[PDB]
Amino acid sequence: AGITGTWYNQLGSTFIVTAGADGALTGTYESAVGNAESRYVLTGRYDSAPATDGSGTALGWTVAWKNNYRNAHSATTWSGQYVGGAEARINTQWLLTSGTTEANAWKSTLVGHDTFTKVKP
Amino acid sequence: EAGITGTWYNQLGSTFIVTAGADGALTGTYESAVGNAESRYVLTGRYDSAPATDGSGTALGWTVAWKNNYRNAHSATTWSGQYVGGAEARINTQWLLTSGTTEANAWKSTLVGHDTFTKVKP
Amino acid sequence: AGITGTWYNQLGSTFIVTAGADGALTGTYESAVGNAESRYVLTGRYDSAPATDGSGTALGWTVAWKNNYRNAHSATTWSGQYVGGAEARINTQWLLTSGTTEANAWKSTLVGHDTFTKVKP
Amino acid sequence: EAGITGTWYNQLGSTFIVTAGADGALTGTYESAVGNAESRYVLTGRYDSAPATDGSGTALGWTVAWKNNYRNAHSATTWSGQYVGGAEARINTQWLLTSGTTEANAWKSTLVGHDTFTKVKP
Numbered sequence: 001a002g003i004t005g006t007w008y009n010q011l012g013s014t015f016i017v018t019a020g021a022d023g024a025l026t027g028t029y030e031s032a033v034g035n036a037e038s039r040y041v042l043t044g045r046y047d048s049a050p051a052t053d054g055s056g057t058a059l060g061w062t063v064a065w066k067n068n069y070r071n072a073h074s075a076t077t078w079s080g081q082y083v084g085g086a087e088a089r090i091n092t093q094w095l096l097t098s099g100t101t102e103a104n105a106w107k108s109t110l111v112g113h114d115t116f117t118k119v120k121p
Numbered sequence: 122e123a124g125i126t127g128t129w130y131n132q133l134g135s136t137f138i139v140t141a142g143a144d145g146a147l148t149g150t151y152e153s154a155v156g157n158a159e160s161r162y163v164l165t166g167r168y169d170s171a172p173a174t175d176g177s178g179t180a181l182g183w184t185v186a187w188k189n190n191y192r193n194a195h196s197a198t199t200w201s202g203q204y205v206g207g208a209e210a211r212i213n214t215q216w217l218l219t220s221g222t223t224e225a226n227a228w229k230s231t232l233v234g235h236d237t238f239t240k241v242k243p
Numbered sequence: 244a245g246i247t248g249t250w251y252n253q254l255g256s257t258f259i260v261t262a263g264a265d266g267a268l269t270g271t272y273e274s275a276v277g278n279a280e281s282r283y284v285l286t287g288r289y290d291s292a293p294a295t296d297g298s299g300t301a302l303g304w305t306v307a308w309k310n311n312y313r314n315a316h317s318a319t320t321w322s323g324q325y326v327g328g329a330e331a332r333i334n335t336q337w338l339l340t341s342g343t344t345e346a347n348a349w350k351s352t353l354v355g356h357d358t359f360t361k362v363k364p
Numbered sequence: 365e366a367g368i369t370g371t372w373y374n375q376l377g378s379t380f381i382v383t384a385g386a387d388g389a390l391t392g393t394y395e396s397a398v399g400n401a402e403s404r405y406v407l408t409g410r411y412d413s414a415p416a417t418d419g420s421g422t423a424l425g426w427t428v429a430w431k432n433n434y435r436n437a438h439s440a441t442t443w444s445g446q447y448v449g450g451a452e453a454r455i456n457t458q459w460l461l462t463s464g465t466t467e468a469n470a471w472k473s474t475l476v477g478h479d480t481f482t483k484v485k486p
């Protein structure tokens with residue numbers, strides 16, 4: 001029924017988001033893995049007038065991994081598309097950059113892929 | 122956050138105007154020199170508002186959806202990277218640009234690259 | 244029973260490979276999608292003495308998309324790990340670079356992810 | 365392929381020694397300036413042996429598994445990119461470095477980055 005809602009990825013992380021009418025994404029993210037506890041703020045953007053040819057809806061969002069419990073000195077961005085229908089899905093690739101010194105910048109950024117559905121594990 | 126807040130440019134000639142809020146928010150506008158883009162687009166992101174002080178960069182990211190009130194490319198870019206302060210301040214990034222596609226074309230939906238932003242004295 | 248064998252990904256592409264004793268990967272790749280027809284040469288490397296703690300076996304390979312039928316002026320590399328067991332798997336991320344002019348180099352490289360099993364679709 | 369064949373260096377100070385064969389093969393050795401690496405490692409890859417002549421680069425890629433007869437990091441890097449010829453020849457790449465991990469740690473198995481190689485007059 002749209003991007004707004006509660007989503008879960010293959011790791012069991014929880015992505016709670018609101019899609020504003022003109023393209024904003026606002027919500028919270030809780031990771032099942034990594035140097036993370038509880039909810040973190042997220043903000044992003046999506047295409048609020050997608051094509052009408054069967055294409056997905058492009059979108060992205062960011063989490064900086066600082067909250068009242070922990071600070072991992074890192075940030076993840078997810079870039080992907082929403083695919084509607086009977087089992088809606090958000091398919092993403094992500095980049096997780098840690099703050100590093102300049103000599104260690106070559107090893108600053110992890111890459112991966114997450115797929116989200118509204119099915120609670 | 123005075124470091125991040127300001128006007129920046131990348132190696133393509135694109136314009137990144139940003140404000141860093143006390144709460145970790147990034148807000149501003151982006152103008153790409155290339156691609157299916159014209160004029161300014163809204164951006165929004167997050168940064169580490171209490172970064173290490175041990176000679177590490179400050180982790181940050183932001184998103185642009187490539188729709189404005191003049192054009193719509195049906196696509197979105199996210200930049201993930203770090204701010205390196207000082208007199209020659211830089212934001213070093215890698216990015217992912219996803220286009221909306223049909224399911225059959227989803228394998229070719231996402232471009233990857235890297236941008237380096239230089240801050241400009243206001 | 245090891246890396247050597249015939250593998251298929253989620254697109255239905257066919258990856259036929261031999262793992263040499265000292266780390267070579269040699270074989271052919273046939274893509275189900277894109278500017279591709281029939282088999283293409285591949286070469287790569289793998290860790291020929293993996294850890295003994297339950298970790299996967301790191302590996303990578305390259306295809307340049309030129310054969311006797313077509314030339315797409317492009318190359319893909321896959322980087323990932325082999326995971327043995329009852330349903331062995333190779334989990335990868337890939338980079339597909341097309342030859343471009345310098346002004347268009349920003350849009351030269353696609354990224355994605357392929358998972359391979361020995362199950363024939 | 366005289367263009368690609370030779371000795372190259374990247375911005376980290378690493379050494380890439382390669383031979384480009386008539387059949388599209390790349391063979392050689394790689395020496396990283398950084399990471400869990402010492403001495404030379406075998407590489408192997410492929411390139412477009414009949415590239416466009418319209419002012420485009422030549423697509424190529426290669427792999428190093430980080431095991432040699434002195435060290436084993438249980439990891440592998442692939443570089444994907446293009447050769448740009450002429451008097452100031454470059455190979456511009458992006459790379460993926462996958463470490464062997466347990467299944468629980470697989471989400472953090474892969475680093476991404478970018479290297480630019482400069483050819484050195486033999």
Ligand SMILES: O=C(O)CCCC[C@@H]1SC[C@@H]2NC(=O)N[C@@H]21
Pocket residue numbers: 009011013030031032033034035036065072074075076094096112114471
């Ligand atoms: O360890 C850190 O630096 C903070 C937590 C990172 C968790 C990552 S973000 C990408 C991937 N998807 C998830 O749901 N969790 C991991």
Ligand SMILES: O=C(O)CCCC[C@@H]1SC[C@@H]2NC(=O)N[C@@H]21
Pocket residue numbers: 131133135152153154155156157158187194196197198216218234236349
């Ligand atoms: O073509 C599109 O879909 C929209 C414009 C994309 C421009 C990209 S975003 C990554 C890179 N950095 C820039 O400043 N511009 C390009």
Ligand SMILES: O=C(O)CCCC[C@@H]1SC[C@@H]2NC(=O)N[C@@H]21
Pocket residue numbers: 228252254256273274275276277278279308315317318319337339355357
């Ligand atoms: O279109 C091209 O330039 C050549 C074919 C590319 C096919 C790509 S490689 C990554 C992905 N995995 C596949 O099995 N096929 C596509």
Ligand SMILES: O=C(O)CCCC[C@@H]1SC[C@@H]2NC(=O)N[C@@H]21
Pocket residue numbers: 106374376378395396397398399400401430437439440441459461477479
């Ligand atoms: O630490 C490891 O697992 C092995 C060494 C990895 C070195 C990486 S490969 C990408 C980048 N470019 C280089 O020349 N060195 C680093």
